[PDB]
Design a protein around this ligand. Sequence first.
Ligand SMILES: CCCCCCCC/C=C/CCCCCCCC(=O)OC[C@H](CO)OC(=O)CCCCCCCCCCCCCCC
Ligand SMILES: CC(C)CCC[C@@H](C)[C@H]1CC[C@H]2[C@@H]3CC=C4C[C@@H](OC(=O)CCC(=O)O)CC[C@]4(C)[C@H]3CC[C@]12C
Ligand SMILES: [Zn+2]
Lengths: 62, 59, 64, 625, 65, 46
Amino acid sequence: HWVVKLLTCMTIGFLFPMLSIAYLISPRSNLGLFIKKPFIKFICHTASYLTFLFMLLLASQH
Amino acid sequence: FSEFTPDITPIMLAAHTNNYEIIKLLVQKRVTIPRPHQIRCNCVECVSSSEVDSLRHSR
Amino acid sequence: SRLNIYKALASPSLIALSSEDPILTAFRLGWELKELSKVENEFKAEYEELSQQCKLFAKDLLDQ
Amino acid sequence: VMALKDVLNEKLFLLACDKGDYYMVKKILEENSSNCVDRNAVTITIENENLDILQLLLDALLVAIDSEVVGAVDILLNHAPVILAAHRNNYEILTMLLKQDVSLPKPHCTLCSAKNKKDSLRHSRFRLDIYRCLASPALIMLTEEDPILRAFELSADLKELSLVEVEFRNDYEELARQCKMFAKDLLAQARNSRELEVILNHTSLSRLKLAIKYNQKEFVSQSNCQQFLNTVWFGQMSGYRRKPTCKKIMTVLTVGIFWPVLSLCYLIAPKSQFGRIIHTPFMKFIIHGASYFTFLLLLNLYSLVYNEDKKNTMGPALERIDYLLILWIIGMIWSDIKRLWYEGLEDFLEESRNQLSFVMNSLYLATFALKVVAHNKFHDFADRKDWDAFHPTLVAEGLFAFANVLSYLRLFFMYTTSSILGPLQISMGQMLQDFGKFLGMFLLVLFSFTIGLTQLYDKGGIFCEQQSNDTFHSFIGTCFALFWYIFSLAHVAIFVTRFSYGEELQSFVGAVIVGTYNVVVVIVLTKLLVAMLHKSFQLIANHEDKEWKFARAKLWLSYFDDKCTLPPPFNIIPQKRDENYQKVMCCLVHRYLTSMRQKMQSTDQATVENLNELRQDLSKFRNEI
Amino acid sequence: LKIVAYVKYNGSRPREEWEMWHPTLIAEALFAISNILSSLRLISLFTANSHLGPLQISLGRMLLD
Amino acid sequence: NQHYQEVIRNLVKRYVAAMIRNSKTHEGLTEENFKELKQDISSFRY
Ligand SMILES: CCCCCCCC/C=C/CCCCCCCC(=O)OC[C@H](CO)OC(=O)CCCCCCCCCCCCCCC
Ligand SMILES: CC(C)CCC[C@@H](C)[C@H]1CC[C@H]2[C@@H]3CC=C4C[C@@H](OC(=O)CCC(=O)O)CC[C@]4(C)[C@H]3CC[C@]12C
Ligand SMILES: [Zn+2]
């Protein structure tokens, strides 16, 4: 059901920084290979852009 | 198994087909078609037929 | 004469019979015919129809 | 220049078998006594219907069925194929082929997953091949005991498969449509009311309720099904249809006005003449409708009988009119659990009218729960202007007003009964789905301009008589100001964009930002919305009559059950038939076969063509002998 | 522009006295415009959705007229 | 290249077969060929 997909997408997006550092440290590790999937990579990019936009929201509030 | 409904008569079927020659042939024998009642008729026969069998009456 | 030659070249039977790989030939011929309609303004319809024919042939070949 | 390039007894035998040559093929067989590909040298004869030549050669199968040649197949059978035969969807070969025992594996495990890894294109194609064989009208009639029920279940089965198989979406929904049209054609062969009642009451109005559950809109809209519904809906008052228009209205008004009496008569004397009036569905709908109209009248009279001295009262007590509304609300609620309990959550939640009853019933309980607590806690006598903003009395009145809007909006379902405003209301309901897609795109545009506008002005509202720049000093205020620009009715003035002290340059930039917002939304997004409503409505207009009739029949069927008979204030107060069904089924099946043959066999070209074929066979025999 | 403004000026002054072409004001205006433009970039992600994506393509196709 | 040619050889074969049968929605010329059969029988005669 779409609610499970939404929960999985949010859970993967919340963990994007850890996946990024895991890929940075060791691509040979399973965590490094985990981000190589195109769908997870797209989710990570979207989460990063959403974080940038949210932190743009903070500046507008002064 | 009967192909046509029991109320079908040869003249009615010929009129349905709209064939001028066959209708001319049959009408030479002086056939008749039962006349219909009014759209709002409330009589004994109309009510009895409608209550007993409405689908057949309408058809 | 140019139109007749390009109609002869864009027949699915000829491509299927005398081309090494009909898919790439169809791609290139469709693109080239599409570019030609923008130059020959008077005969644009025919060239668009030929390009559509080439694209349809490629898709139908893939469908098998 | 480019040069184009292509990247004896057998020939005598092939050319002979091509064109009606029998004796000198017998000669060629004699010559060979003492598999060529232009082919087994037999398929060409199979496609030519030259059975005499074929029989001589016999002394391929899938090709014969592809050509629908019964003679070739019969000879080949005499001298899976069933799946391909069902694809052609014809009776003669299907009956003959199935005479020998034939099975067909059912479609879905761990083993199937292994096959999908090796070849997924082949696996998907095989599954679609089987389901297209199963959805054959000829196969269902010859193999299934209850063809009408089989078409219902398969049609719902194939619709689900279209959703999962996104790439095979088009093929599956074509198979589901074919199943739906078959069961509707079977029902059209009923001739009298005795057969109609047998079909629509069988249990495996169970068949009529099963069609509504499976969304058989074509089946419901049939004239035989529509005629049956009208008799049950009006019941013993069939004389209502004979009355003129002027006489019909006086009957509805009289029944509605005296609704308390009729509802009371059924309570004390259910078996009396006035007791059985409710039992007919049409009068029950009117009595329930008039009961709701009095509830709305009480709400309108609530403010009129409100004592002015209570406007400054903080702990007002419940009036007699308040007890009346409490009785109705419990009555409406009590009916709601009964409908939900008898049907289920998913069926009950699906209808829009039920959803609107959920919210308004919770809002009516909240305002009365707050009203009782307020009377027991806060009873001080003070003017209205001095109360707290969030005092419970003020919160209670806010929820009461909101629930009054949802009470009047429930009357939309009553338009379905009318044959004039019915089709129009259903058409507007289906265009609400296109509005949701535009909400997603517009919501991001409104959020984008809110970010920039509050960034420019906060560093340096609209509901005042003199609107000021303060509307841009908050996120909530900025969203409200941009919201009122969508109408193009000049709700907000341009002077709002000007900075109070100076900022000449920043005032101009803010005006340019607002001007860009107006063009994007009022001129571009609005015109795009009108473009799709023009396109979608034309497609919807095609099925206007079929969609309205399905909705009206769904509404009528809810009043056939005797589970809920009393209006809401009064509700709170305390083998023999299977054999008959088979006889009708065989008549309907055999009528359908006879009728369908005339549908496509009308030009009779293959009759004169068959005569010409006999002529050519005779001519070939002549010179040959 | 922020770096230029920081380098050029060292003291403080009330806002009402600054000239209209002060570097700080231009910096703030450009920042606001950049925020507006950055928020609108999310439209390009509508293509991955079965509902929103066809509407986005159709809107893009009609912009020529 | 060898594998690509083999698949292309079969794809073209099914294509020419497919649209001929899809063009048979308009093929009622079987009777005219039947007359060709009468003509062939006459040729065998003389
Ligand atoms: C979701 C995406 C949808 C598509 C988005 C792009 C749509 C295409 C258009 C973009 C809008 C561009 C900005 C136009 C307005 C600029 C702001 C503005 O003028 O504010 C007044 C501001 C402040 O007073 O004044 C100026 O900017 C001074 C110059 C004004 C000159 C007159 C107007 C020029 C022509 C504009 C035509 C707009 C369309 C009208 C159609 C009847
Ligand atoms: C107005 C404020 C609240 C900001 C609104 C932001 C939206 C315009 C953006 C932000 C994140 C976007 C989503 C990010 C990722 C996806 C998943 C994408 O699908 C997938 O890749 C997963 C499979 C699926 O669920 O279909 C479809 C588009 C969608 C919902 C995007 C739709 C547009 C969204 C909601
Ligand atoms: Zn009468």
